[PDB]
Design a protein around this nucleic acid. Structure first.
Ligand code: CA
Ligand code: CA
Ligand code: ZN
Length: 845
RNA sequence: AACAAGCGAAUGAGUCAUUCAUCCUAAGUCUGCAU
RNA sequence: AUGCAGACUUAGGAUGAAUGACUCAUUCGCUUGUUC
């Protein structure tokens, strides 16, 4: 419901590329352009794609206008290079012929040329929007290839005017005729002739008896050359989102469908079909360049003014790209990284800014700085939500300038200006709304968690490219209340030098010979030592605040950099084992930091002594694990020594990590990743398909928890005891995982629900409560080319369920008839339940 | 890769609901103990 | 009053799983219309 939440889908607008904006539409005299060269080169060496030239009014940003992108076609891959060229001038005759080329081929293949009648006859320039006009036209191989453009412009004046075989345009040799571009005149769609039938004509068999009857009835047009061979020619299809590798290099080899037109209906174009094949690549290439242009525009808006700093447009691009956008990149890792950069920087800034606020009000002031609500506020105020690439990317909808837009989404979003203002009625809590789908004015539904993710992802993107300083610039550019004011960190040492160090028993020396750092101040490490039970003016609660953040950031920087192909949720699984406070307790004991936690609490002394007693020497070399948890003060010392390491070392994070990398020597790698037993238990029980009753209680001092798991014949009960009962659930789950890894008329079903998940919903909630394992389905389909109360379909799935009902013999049943696959399962569950009622197991009422 | 649509499926997401979890941080109440 | 402990709940960040339903993308089978 709140700003920054996932549930509030809020409508935002898209930003125009600002370099695709040309004012050169409707000049009187020829307009000058900056050119970029699209070199397409396939991995198959048998067929060539033509190189194109993008002709913008404005220069590109040298990171956009020199980029290589891979295009994943069907069963082949094309490298597209966007190397620059020179500034190219175009005369008005050249400018009209270039606009005719672009408008002709994009409208003839992707659009509908012959609207209704020829599109280029009726008035254009409505189709040349000034927000998006770029004039992309082939090159002869930095050249510009006026041969194909002149042929296309000549066939434009032709169609406005409307042994060798005869096209409507011109005659052609019968042999040098295959694989050439051709536009049919009676329905204006570009073809490309694969072959001419060797022994066929307009009289060939086609509810039409023949081809010439088909044209004489459908179009009413007398073929004045029936003798000549009608031509099989592959049609012009639509463009297909080459930017993502969807097939993963499923889709089977489909034959080309060819149309067969008499050559009189065809008009010859001297455009090669190298050009025609390259145009199918242009919607995805220009969508990628459009996106990189917005990314570099964001980079320019953010600036940096740093002498040694540069950030790619591809990394800004991935930082704005929500996962609703099927792509290779998806911002999710950068926004985990930027969550932790932001949390570090916010904690370090509040630590240094407020030397008197303790762990709680520092932590709450951080909750005000680092929230998704705060980052959503500072991102939408900064108008960074327009750069969000939260879109599926319909290439069918991609229209070049001059192309008609056969697929318009007319802006019924209620706002008539481009950029929406953040007001409610542009917020929606409901389902059925389509997140990502733009209208034609560029407005689309954004999850609003992804706006805050945008913020964090650009914090992380400037972190990767510029280190801490450029990420801190990105944060101040958003308006994050951080400044880092470096003498202020010196002022912290000037809150340390005034105190008289208390270096009494040379305790710090032994502690520093455990952590291999010198401590040029030594009161930071005394404060990181000092527990709140000593009742001093100082304590480690404030340095543990700082060190929670510096360790969460140093570890997720390690995890971001090492594991480059795994996203959040495995990085969060790994971070919740490195920054786990139990792990910090084992790291405190393993390096023996725990003998320097200075405290005056006897109950904390018996918690330390129980936890040192709980360590068991392992069965193989490994690591000495504990039996029980052991208190937070152990791990809080580890955090606070990291926090003292920052303020000691003038916030040098490479030094803080140079010290703390050998501390947790066995860093968790995702092979070595062992999740908490409860999580791993109910993930394994749900993935295999079983449930467990769970029961925890507080009998004596320490809590008890039993877990009755039901496998198919037995109910096996794993039970454990621990202080917290979340960890008694953890130990009962670990007991159950050991004794599971060795192995690896009374009930009321309640009312059957409807709305197509209802019966499987009720039987699943029933199997969880009255503990039976999940029913497994066996659907059966009889697909028919004839259609099948009912609404129509063509498969008629009749499904039978099984349920391995415990302490009974198993039961399979079936469903009458269902068009859907989900419904078949549903009706099979219903006929099962009524059958079960008859079998004296459950009562529906 | 003819095109649009509808229907069915498969796969990957996102989101909601349900009911459960993990990790870090703060806090409140209730219960217990003790100084 | 303070400390500790546990339950519960909330707030903040990062998340994950089963089930159910949408939605999207990609892909396939069919159907109709269109092209043929
Ligand atoms: Ca986030
Ligand atoms: Ca801690
Ligand atoms: Zn709109």
């Amino acid at each position: 419901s709140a700003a920054g939440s996932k549930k509030r889908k809020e409508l935002h607008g898209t930003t125009c590329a600002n370099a695709l904006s040309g004012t050169w539409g409707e000049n009187i005299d020829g307009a000058t352009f900056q050119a970029y060269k699209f070199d397409f080169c396939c991995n198959i060496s048998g067929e060539v794609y033509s190189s194109f030239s993008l002709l913008l009014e404005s220069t590109l940003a040298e990171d956009v206008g020199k980029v290589e992108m891979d295009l994943y076609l069907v069963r082949k891959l094309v490298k597209a290079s966007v190397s620059p060229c020179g500034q190219i001038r175009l005369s008005q005759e050249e400018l009209v012929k270039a606009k005719y080329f672009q408008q002709f081929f994009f409208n003839g293949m992707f659009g509908k040329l012959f609207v209704g009648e020829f599109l280029l006859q009726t008035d254009t320039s409505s189709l040349w929007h000034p927000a998006f006009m770029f004039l992309l036209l082939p090159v002869e191989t930095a050249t510009i290839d006026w041969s194909a453009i002149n042929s296309c412009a000549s066939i434009v004046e032709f169609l406005k005017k409307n042994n060798l075989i005869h096209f409507a345009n011109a005659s052609s040799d019968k042999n040098s005729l295959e694989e050439l571009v051709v536009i049919a005149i009676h329905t204006g769609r570009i073809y490309s002739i694969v072959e001419a039938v060797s022994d066929s004509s307009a009289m060939s068999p086609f509810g039409y008896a023949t081809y010439a009857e088909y044209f004489n009835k459908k179009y009413g047009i007398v073929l004045a050359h029936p003798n000549q061979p009608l031509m099989k020619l592959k049609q012009s299809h639509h463009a297909h989102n080459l930017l993502v590798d969807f097939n993963e290099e499923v889709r089977k080899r489909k034959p080309n469908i060819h149309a067969h037109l008499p050559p009189e209906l065809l008009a010859r174009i001297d455009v090669p079909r190298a050009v025609l094949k390259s145009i199918y690549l242009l919607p995805s290439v220009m969508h990628r360049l459009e996106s990189l242009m917005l990314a570099s525009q964001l980079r320019e808006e953010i600036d940096c003014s740093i002498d040694n700093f540069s950030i790619s447009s591809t990394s800004i691009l991935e930082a704005v790209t929500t996962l609703t956008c099927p792509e290779s990149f998806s911002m999710e890792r950068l926004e985990l990284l930027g969550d932790s950069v932001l949390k570090y920087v916010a904690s370090c800034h509040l630590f240094l800014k407020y030397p008197d606020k303790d762990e709680g009000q520092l932590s709450r002031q951080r909750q005000s700085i680092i929230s998704n609500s705060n980052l959503h506020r500072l991102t939408t105020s900064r108008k960074l939500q327009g750069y969000i690439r939260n879109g599926a990317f319909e290439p069918r909808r991609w229209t070049a300038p001059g192309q008609f837009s056969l697929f318009p989404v007319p802006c019924k979003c209620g706002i008539d200006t481009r950029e929406v203002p953040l007001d409610p009625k542009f917020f929606t809590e409901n389902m059925t709304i389509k997140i990502g789908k733009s209208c034609d004015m560029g407005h689309r539904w954004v999850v609003s968690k992804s706006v805050s993710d945008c913020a964090e992802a650009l914090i992380g993107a400037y972190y990767v490219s510029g280190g801490l300083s450029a990420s801190l610039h990105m944060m101040k550019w958003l308006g994050i209340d951080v400044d880092f004011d470096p003498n202020l960190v010196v002022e912290a040492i000037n809150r340390v030098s005034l105190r008289c160090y208390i270096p009494k028993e040379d305790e710090l020396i032994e502690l520093e010979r455990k952590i291999q750092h010198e401590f040029s101040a030594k009161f930071l490490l005394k404060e990181a030592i000092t527990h709140s039970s000593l009742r001093e003016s100082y304590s480690y609660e404030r340095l543990e605040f700082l060190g929670d953040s510096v360790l969460d950031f140093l570890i997720t920087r390690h995890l971001f950099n090492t594991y480059e192909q795994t996203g959040p949720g495995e990085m969060t699984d790994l971070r919740s084992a490195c920054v786990n406070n139990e792990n910090f307790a084992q790291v405190a004991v393993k390096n023996n930091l725990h003998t320097h936690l200075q405290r005056c609490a006897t109950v904390l002394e018996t918690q330390i002594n129980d936890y040192l007693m709980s360590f068991q020497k392992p069965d193989e070399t490994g690591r000495s694990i504990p039996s029980i948890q052991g208190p937070k003060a152990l791990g809080d010392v580890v955090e606070s020594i990291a926090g003292a390491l920052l303020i000691d070392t003038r916030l040098d994070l490479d030094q803080v990590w140079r010290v703390f990398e050998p501390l947790l020597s066995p860093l968790v790698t995702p092979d070595k990743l062992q999740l908490p037993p409860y999580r791993e238990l109910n993930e394994l029980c749900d993935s295999l398909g079983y449930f467990f009753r769970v029961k925890c209680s507080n009998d004596g001092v320490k809590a008890q928890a039993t877990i009755q798991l039901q496998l198919d014949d037995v109910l096996l009960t794993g039970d454990g005891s621990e202080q917290t009962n979340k960890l008694a659930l953890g130990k009962a789950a670990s007991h159950l995982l050991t004794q599971l890894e060795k192995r690896n008329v009374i009930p009321f079903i309640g009312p059957i629900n409807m709305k197509k998940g209802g019966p499987r919903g009720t039987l699943h909630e029933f199997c969880k409560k009255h503990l039976w394992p999940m029913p497994t389905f066996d659907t059966s389909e009889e697909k028919s080319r004839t259609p099948f109360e009912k609404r129509t379909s063509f498969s008629s799935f009749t499904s039978t369920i099984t349920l391995r009902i415990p302490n009974r013999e198993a039961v399979m049943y079936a469903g009458e008839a269902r068009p859907d696959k989900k419904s078949s399962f549903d009706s099979a569950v219903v006929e099962l339940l009524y059958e079960l009622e008859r079998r004296k197991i459950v009562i529906i009422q």
